[PDB]
Amino acid sequence: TVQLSDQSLRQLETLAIHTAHLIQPHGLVVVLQEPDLTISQISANCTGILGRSPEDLLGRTLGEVFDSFLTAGQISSLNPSKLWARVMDFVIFDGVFHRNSDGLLVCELEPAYTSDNLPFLGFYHMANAALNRLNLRDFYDVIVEEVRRMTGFDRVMLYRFDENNHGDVIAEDKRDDMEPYLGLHYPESDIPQPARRLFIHNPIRVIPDVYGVAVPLTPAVNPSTNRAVDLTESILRSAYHCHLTYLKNMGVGASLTISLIKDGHLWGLIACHHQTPKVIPFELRKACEFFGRVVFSNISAQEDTETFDYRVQLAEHEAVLLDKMTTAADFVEGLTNHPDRLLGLTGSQGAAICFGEKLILVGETPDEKAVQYLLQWLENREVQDVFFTSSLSQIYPDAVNFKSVASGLLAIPIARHNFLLWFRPEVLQTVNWGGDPNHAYEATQKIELHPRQSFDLWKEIVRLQSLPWQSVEIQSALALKKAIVNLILRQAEEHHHHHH
Amino acid sequence: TVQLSDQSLRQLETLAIHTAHLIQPHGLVVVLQEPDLTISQISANCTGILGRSPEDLLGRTLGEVFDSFLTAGQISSLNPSKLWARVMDFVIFDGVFHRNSDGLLVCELEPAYTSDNLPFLGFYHMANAALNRLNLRDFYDVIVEEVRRMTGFDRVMLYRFDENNHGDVIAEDKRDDMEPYLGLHYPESDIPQPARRLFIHNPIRVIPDVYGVAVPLTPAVNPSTNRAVDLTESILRSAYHCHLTYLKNMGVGASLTISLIKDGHLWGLIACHHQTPKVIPFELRKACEFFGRVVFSNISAQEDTETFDYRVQLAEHEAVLLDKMTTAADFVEGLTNHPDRLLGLTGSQGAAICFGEKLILVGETPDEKAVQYLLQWLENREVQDVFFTSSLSQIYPDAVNFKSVASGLLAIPIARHNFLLWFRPEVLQTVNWGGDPNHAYEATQKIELHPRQSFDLWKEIVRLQSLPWQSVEIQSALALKKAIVNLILRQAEEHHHHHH
Numbered sequence A, B: 001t002v003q004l005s006d007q008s009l010r011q012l013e014t015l016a017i018h019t020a021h022l023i024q025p026h027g028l029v030v031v032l033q034e035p036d037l038t039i040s041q042i043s044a045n046c047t048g049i050l051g052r053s054p055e056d057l058l059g060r061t062l063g064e065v066f067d068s069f070l071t072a073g074q075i076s077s078l079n080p081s082k083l084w085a086r087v088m089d090f091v092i093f094d095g096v097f098h099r100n101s102d103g104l105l106v107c108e109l110e111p112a113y114t115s116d117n118l119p120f121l122g123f124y125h126m127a128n129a130a131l132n133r134l135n136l137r138d139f140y141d142v143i144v145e146e147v148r149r150m151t152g153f154d155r156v157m158l159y160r161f162d163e164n165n166h167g168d169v170i171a172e173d174k175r176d177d178m179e180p181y182l183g184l185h186y187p188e189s190d191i192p193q194p195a196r197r198l199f200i201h202n203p204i205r206v207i208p209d210v211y212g213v214a215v216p217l218t219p220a221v222n223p224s225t226n227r228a229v230d231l232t233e234s235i236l237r238s239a240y241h242c243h244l245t246y247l248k249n250m251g252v253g254a255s256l257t258i259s260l261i262k263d264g265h266l267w268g269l270i271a272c273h274h275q276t277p278k279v280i281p282f283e284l285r286k287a288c289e290f291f292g293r294v295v296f297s298n299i300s301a302q303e304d305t306e307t308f309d310y311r312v313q314l315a316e317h318e319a320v321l322l323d324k325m326t327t328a329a330d331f332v333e334g335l336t337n338h339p340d341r342l343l344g345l346t347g348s349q350g351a352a353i354c355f356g357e358k359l360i361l362v363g364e365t366p367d368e369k370a371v372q373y374l375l376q377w378l379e380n381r382e383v384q385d386v387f388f389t390s391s392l393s394q395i396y397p398d399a400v401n402f403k404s405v406a407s408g409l410l411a412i413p414i415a416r417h418n419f420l421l422w423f424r425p426e427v428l429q430t431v432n433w434g435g436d437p438n439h440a441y442e443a444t445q446k447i448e449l450h451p452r453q454s455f456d457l458w459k460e461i462v463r464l465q466s467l468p469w470q471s472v473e474i475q476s477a478l479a480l481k482k483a484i485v486n487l488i489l490r491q492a493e494e495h496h497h498h499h500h
């Protein structure tokens, strides 16, 4: 169980979903050798929809298997383009070209339905009206609602990954008869690393039919490159079976997933579900993204500005401390006479200054002997860099007896034996999981992972834990350490004299 | 002259400013072998400031040449750190570590002045107040003013690269006695490609003394890697001499340059100049960037939203056309009865529909025979993709006689012989250059480039040229072509029947 859990986690992080050679059944995939546009490989479903199989096809080229009206960046202008064939029966595709990271042309023919197109005044009309009409919550809700408006989906949500790559549904529009996922929290193993890295490279993933059986590329390997073909940028690649199994027991027949990138990292996803299978054409997908992205630009801007705002809060405290410190006598005197500021510097409720032989406690701290034993623990463990923890109990067992006052500890050293300590109380935090995280998935045994069946609200109460240490707060704490080091250095050179 | 101009341009794009091995004189550079932190190479200026040269130093390690209070991502926590040495004389540095793209540790010791620090309430106090107190112009001016406030610089500007990588000073704060550069336009050769690619990787470049003579790394090559060391991420690397020569005749003794990135491309620069040499410490630099970046996040958001807004303008036109087209008889009938919409679709003043045997002109066009000869020119040149030009004169010489009505031409083909054309009139555009662009630089001859001496306003009048074709307008034009192709395809399958 514990061992099975362990390597099953290691199996998730390493999955090769991109080197899988199976395509969704509704559309055709071909990989083109050139200059010529010869068909080296093709999906097996061509038999059922074209009529000419990997007998008649393969190396007969795109030229005249299809009709229409090795290149380079011209692919962009070709995306999408109408390709059609007559086989007695008239099929019309919208083809989308791309080149792999390996550097070979894949063409993905989706059945085109749009001979007649669009809602009133385009896919954008209503959505733009809402965006202009203007807080972060407003942005969150506009995405999911106006995307659900454009699309016709049973459920549309905004899924935001946290610092541990878990995720939360932070916004949702849905039919009123469906049970809400708003505010549910999900394990990181649901969207494992290989799936997340895909969304840095592939901004859209659509699955019009979950129950559709994936057909294999023939041959499974590329004849030229001597490898499986990388379908990371692939529209028609079939999602890993486990994820399909995951969507089935959640009750989803179709999905559209658009990823949101901040500063080149996966911030989150616009996640769309349908109970029934559904056609989401290319132009619609591309529309939902362009909108999603514009609002996200504004989301990114806001959270950036809120981040800068908190940084200046802590910057005021620092300055007040740096001013009162230098100008007063012992720097320790300056720090202690302004508790409010010392505590605010890192968003904490208590602190301790251990310098030379004097030990000063400020605010809500553990009692002196307790902090003094902690300081010895800090010394015994040879802390040189910078130490913080949101749950001191679980690394310092004795800390359980003052978890009320110091479940959190930020500890910064100032040379040998000297420390600055900030303390934080236990704050009970309730997490609302989408299902029991103790069985986030299940492994059978030859390791075989299977997704969980229930996703019903499962309330956790997190204990023996403070608020988490934000990075701006730790940097602030080091800004003080550096200002203190500045003063020791100022003294040092005040006692230095030149030459003779 | 013309040949000299040509290869001198080719020399600029290929310069290896990053593989130069010369460092600025005020600070020390060392490259550390490890595990050990041995000094493999070091700047020659150590003699003049440490007292121990590449005799006493080299392989004596950072350990005890310096005092303080091969790693990995711990470099971040070490940046910056106080390093000091006593050599009878007490020097105090602020060291900043980084690892190359080649993967080796470079340590850059800047003389530390800040034993006593900061303005009131930190480097941010005033700047944050302005940002919250809230259009793009507002953002532009807040950057340059509040940066000039924080810094004490003689001139601070916002430099924005255009589509051709030329640039414009779009915002500026300066002493009132200095001649303004606001609104001046500069050649792309001033910030050549190698300099631009540097700012994707290195967000800050500071030169506290332009006149300071660069000292060489000894040895010039790294002994382990067998190459010159890549100083792209280097603080203390000396800017290429030509750029220093460029700053001298502009009258700049010191500069600080912070780059602004949108969606992973170089949008622009916060460019700071001082007439006199100036010390800009690390913490100040890092402050100016963090602020600059926060406001830029809001800039990026705004221009993104203005981009989306124009896209919806054109999206309305398209929809109106797609609606009136299909439902009416000949699609050409629908398009022609709504000239306003057809012209607005691509922001143009006239158009022509050439389909089958009928040729319809709309709005301000060249006369029929002229457009008909143009259509033959379009046919004779075998246009298959999509053709546009902001100056039709210079590719179609005869177009000079109707430059008043069609200096600009967007031309989209709909299968064989059929075209959609949009026309745009000559609009006189005046460019205000910072100096005569005809002598943007000068080459002597063994090619030796030298920067220009004058940067005084040089007014250009651009002729025979329309407004430039934006990408949203071209895509819009193709959205119509695709909707027309949809209708031909709809007919095609309306005449198709199944089986027997």
Ligand SMILES: *[C@H](C)[C@H]1/C(=C/c2[nH]c(/C=C3N=C(/C=C4\NC(=O)C(CC)=C4C)C(C)=C\3CCC(=O)O)c(CCC(=O)O)c2C)NC(=O)[C@@H]1C
Residues within 6 Å of the ligand: A015, A017, A018, A157, A159, A181, A186, A189, A190, A191, A192, A195, A198, A205, A207, A238, A239, A240, A242, A243, A246, A255, A256, A257, A269, A271, A272, A273, A440, A441, A449, A450, A451, A452
């Ligand atoms: C299989 C045993 C394990 C597993 C693997 C896995 N997951 C994915 C992909 C996704 N998971 C999500 C998750 C959600 N979307 C939601 O709307 C919600 C809550 C309502 C959740 C939790 C998403 C969005 C994706 C990808 C986007 C998409 O729809 O495709 C993959 C992807 C594989 C691929 O080939 O693309 C894999 C292999 N998931 C599990 O739960 C098991 C632990």
Ligand SMILES: *[C@H](C)[C@H]1/C(=C/c2[nH]c(/C=C3N=C(/C=C4\NC(=O)C(CC)=C4C)C(C)=C\3CCC(=O)O)c(CCC(=O)O)c2C)NC(=O)[C@@H]1C
Residues within 6 Å of the ligand: B015, B017, B018, B157, B159, B181, B186, B189, B190, B191, B192, B195, B198, B205, B207, B238, B239, B240, B242, B243, B246, B255, B256, B257, B269, B271, B272, B273, B440, B441, B449, B450, B451, B452
């Ligand atoms: C030399 C013959 C050619 C040349 C080379 C060159 N330029 C640069 C770097 C920069 N150029 C700019 C330009 C401006 N900054 C401004 O404020 C203004 C107007 C007021 C201009 C035009 C900038 C900002 C930089 C870099 C930033 C910095 O300050 O360092 C390089 C860089 C080399 C390096 O090693 O970093 C080189 C080689 N410039 C010319 O004009 C000649 C054509």
